[PDB]
Design a protein around this ligand. Sequence first.
Ligand SMILES: N#Cc1ccc(O[C@H]2CC[C@H](NC(=O)CCSc3nc4ccccc4c(=O)[nH]3)CC2)cc1
Ligand SMILES: [Zn+2]
Length: 210
Amino acid sequence: GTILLDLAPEDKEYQSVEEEMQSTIREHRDGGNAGGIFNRYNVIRIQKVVNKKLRERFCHRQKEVSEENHNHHNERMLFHGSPFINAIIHKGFDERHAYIGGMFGAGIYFAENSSKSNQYVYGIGGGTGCPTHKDRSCYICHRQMLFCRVTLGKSFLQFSTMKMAHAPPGHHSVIGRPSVNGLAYAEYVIYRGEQAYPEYLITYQIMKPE
Ligand SMILES: N#Cc1ccc(O[C@H]2CC[C@H](NC(=O)CCSc3nc4ccccc4c(=O)[nH]3)CC2)cc1
Ligand SMILES: [Zn+2]
């Protein structure tokens, strides 16, 4: 199955991952309703996800995408947050659990900003918050998000991605780009679970502002 390898805080890989997370905290126009109010994270664990079967499916797909994108697979390290982390790290991402509805197409979404992904940790718009206190801004309960390897290949740019079922012909991913009456930040979407590898499992808590 999967093997989770703990990284030590003195390891530069650990430091690297935490910096990208802490440094990509942004202002969200919702007053912190979805992800909570914080200026910082308390990263309490970072585990490397080792799964040979998964890495091989990922690499094989990366090869097909390459063939179709003039030999560039176009890999990008992005964040993902959702209530299904434990399923993802063991079974990998699966498009079959992605459905067209609301503001989402039938794909798997990613963000370059950790605070964006944080908003989805407990569900769309934060859902009802943590399981124990039903608090979207809970500072007690431990949250988890993934910093993943995402194969974007040839991306199709657009303003909305809510009614997509697959990437457009000739493409392998879709990026919802910013717009005045639309998105505030870009969102990266894949429609095949094997186009993303859950490299890092980050366990953390948002911290209250001091
Ligand atoms: N049971 C079960 C089971 C259930 C689901 C599963 O894989 C799912 C496959 C589809 C995913 N669903 C999504 O990707 C969309 C909603 S979660 C989300 N939305 C964003 C929007 C913009 C920017 C960043 C993010 C982000 O970080 N997370 C969730 C996980 C695998 C196993
Ligand atoms: Zn809680």
